[PDB]
Symmetry: C2
């Protein structure tokens, strides 16, 4: 059994059952040796019962017929608790989050709730009372976060896809550290109703998948206007060129890796391989994107998180992970004046970014500048985390779409990923470009660099 | 001389710009409202500029020789700028962008007009220089914050003026002085060289004798300006003219705070509209109403604190007492309060969008009532807030607006209405507003004077 959309469809087609798919997933879950992946797992027998019921129904109109998935524990799934990795926060949602409801109606099956950095605050994966999920290539290394368990579960073949959320960059960072495709839809496309807020105005539901095509199908299914969510936006499609594509990259002197020379080398290598794609590389000034990024935690947007968990925080700050607690407690000193100043700075930076967008169709970045051992992060938990947001943190502030794809491996055996960044609503066009890049650079996914499921994406157009 | 774009072009077509200026100054000297101007150029210097222009070709100058007034929160080189706060006063080295563009089109600045201090108020009374008055009755407020700008045009002192609109000042003093107020989609006109009030919401606004004239001035001043972080490139969103749906609030949402004459005149406007080619649609005005409340009732007031915070901490007694207390109170707002306001706005935006699905344009009383200056002096916060009832959502919900005369109540006071449309609907709105104006109350200013041509036509 290949745990991908294609693998499962194929296994079912050749006489296999959903019940067997679930059995195998559970077998894999039981043998996987990372104690931090899951916060709350369904009992196998109840999932088997759901498997059977579905087995006995038509596959018609269910594009995700019998497909197991994991859901990050800041996203509501009826019948399981939801905690945002904060035991004191724990509640029992009556209803599936909207995106979950849509995926399940397409026939997908929830296996359990995956671990995360608490209140989706962190890019490391280590800020959880449940322990730190680990890089699937080396247990000494961070899985990345905050969608830590979701990425690990897919890369380890436990489920075919997973949901996370992305605010600072969590749709992308743990995809890179675990050799996955991370689809980060334009904000507002997928409902955040039934999702615990982090930065409410910025939060996106995000997809971890084995390929761009599979991630894209999952995204489209989950996508849809939802008036319950104040930030929901109806879909638009903005097209990007294919013939004549211009790919922006930062200036040489803007390529920061915080000492990681292997990562620097692999980024350059990606650029080297790209001359055989039908694309032109354009050096752009990355500064306005870089400075916009800093506003997320270095500016007043952190106050959004304080809004989200402020009741629990004042009630009992000791209930909080100590690093997250400290970050959100500091936000308390920001005024409305600070918030508007941040907005003014963002508006100006947006002007400057727009001038750079005039030069390129899409931006190509290291997903992260480096990767860290868990032990290194525990010793230096704020600073080393912030490094990981160097290239990610402007994306939702500047209303962009993004896709993280595998770009290769350094010699010590750790993955290196890159991220494509495009303007709002360019999600479909980006999917095509990303698929092409992925299949050019590092055409496999997950812990075994496994064969990518078909189909490859083709020009519509 | 008729002090309109058309009146001036006609007069020049053996008259001179020098004569135009002379006449404007003669009118300024006679007018009799001591509160209209903060800083007037010396006649002699304007005359010299007039002569130099006279000797220039009119080619390429669509506002060839046209006098205008500029609100004193907008920079004009060679005059001070104070936002009606003497301690704030500075001497700008350069014209604000919009001023630069207008002067390049041949228009001539006569002076800086009085305003509510730091553009904070809809009354016109919050100025140390005194309260300019309704041109129809000295006992009544001119409205604000663009108080002097509106009076100067309605009194025939200048052919148009610039103000700024945040809460509603492009509209309220237009209503109270029988003028067209054009309120451009935010970002269209640069706010560079304009003192911020709510930086992210502020609009340069135009007071004119007609929609067409106000529209020409708007287009000339319009243009992307990277110096302004909130500047946006022109887009144009079209509205229908055949099949037009005009939303109005539900009967029970038509608030006039006891002013039954205004209520009667609003209904009258609806009564006359059956002979325009438009359908009236009752809409739920609640989400617009509740969004309006966020401007001063929510965290946006903190934007004003951001703008004048240094001066306020240096010397709060340097501030108008009402403006001072409003901005001092903003000090207690956190970033958390600011984000909650945005969350509330985003939700209210969802609900408003559902109403927008039912109409092309919204038609409102410009203000629910009008007040005697003395009434406002006694009750300066409450009575002001009333005036924002229909205006205050417009920049928060990213809308365009035009205020046009809608008639007069029996006691001789004007009553104005405002058309509200989606962002970038400015050109299509102008056509609708022109039609409505000419249907309801086809005159402008203190004399209900003949509207200059042209009438706007569909294209």
């Amino acid at each position: 059994l290949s745990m991908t959309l294609e693998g499962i469809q194929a296994f079912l087609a050749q006489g296999g059952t959903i019940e067997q798919v679930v059995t195998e997933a559970y077998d894999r879950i039981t043998r996987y040796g990372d104690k931090a992946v899951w916060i709350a797992l369904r009992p196998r027998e109840e999932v088997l019962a759901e498997a059977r019921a579905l087995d006995a129904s038509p596959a018609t109109g269910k594009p995700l017929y019998g497909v197991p998935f994991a859901v990050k524990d800041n996203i509501d799934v009826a019948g399981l608790p939801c905690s945002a990795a904060c035991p004191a926060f724990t509640y029992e949602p009556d209803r599936d989050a909207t995106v979950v409801a849509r995926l399940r109606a397409a026939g997908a099956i929830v296996l359990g709730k995956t671990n995360l950095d608490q209140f989706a605050t962190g890019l490391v994966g280590t800020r959880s009372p449940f322990g730190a999920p680990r890089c699937v290539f080396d247990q000494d290394y961070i899985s990345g976060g905050s969608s830590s368990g979701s990425a690990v579960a897919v890369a380890a073949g436990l489920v075919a896809f997973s949901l996370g959320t992305d605010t600072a960059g969590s749709g992308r960072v743990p995809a890179a550290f675990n050799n996955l495709v991370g689809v980060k839809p334009t904000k507002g496309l997928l409902s955040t109703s039934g999702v615990v807020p982090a930065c409410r105005s910025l939060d996106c539901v995000t997809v971890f998948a084995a390929s761009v095509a599979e991630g894209t199908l999952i995204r489209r299914i989950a996508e849809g206007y939802d008036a319950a969510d104040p930030y929901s936006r109806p879909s638009q499609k903005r097209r990007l060129p294919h013939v004549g594509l211009r790919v922006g990259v930062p200036r040489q002197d803007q390529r920061e890796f915080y000492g990681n020379t292997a990562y620097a080398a692999l980024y350059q290598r990606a650029l080297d391989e790209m001359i055989s794609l039908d694309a032109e590389l354009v050096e752009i000034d990355f500064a306005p994107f870089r400075d916009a990024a800093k506003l997320l935690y270095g500016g007043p947007w952190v106050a959004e998180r304080l809004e989200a968990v402020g009741d629990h925080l004042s009630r009992a700050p000791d209930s909080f992970d100590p690093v997250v607690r400290s970050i959100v407690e500091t936000a308390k000193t920001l005024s409305a004046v600070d918030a508007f100043r941040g907005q003014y700075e963002l508006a100006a930076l947006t002007q400057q970014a727009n001038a750079q967008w005039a030069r390129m169709d899409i931006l190509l970045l290291p997903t992260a500048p480096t990767i860290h051992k868990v032990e290194a992060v525990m010793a230096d938990p704020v600073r080393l985390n912030s490094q990981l947001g160097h290239y990610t943190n402007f994306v939702n502030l500047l209303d962009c779409a993004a896709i993280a794809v595998p770009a290769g491996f350094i010699e010590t055996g750790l993955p290196f990923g890159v991220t494509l960044v495009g303007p709002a609503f360019s999600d479909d066009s980006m999917a095509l470009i990303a698929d092409r890049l992925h299949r050019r650079l590092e055409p496999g996914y997950g812990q075994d660099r496994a064969s990518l499921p078909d189909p490859v994406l083709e020009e519509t157009n």
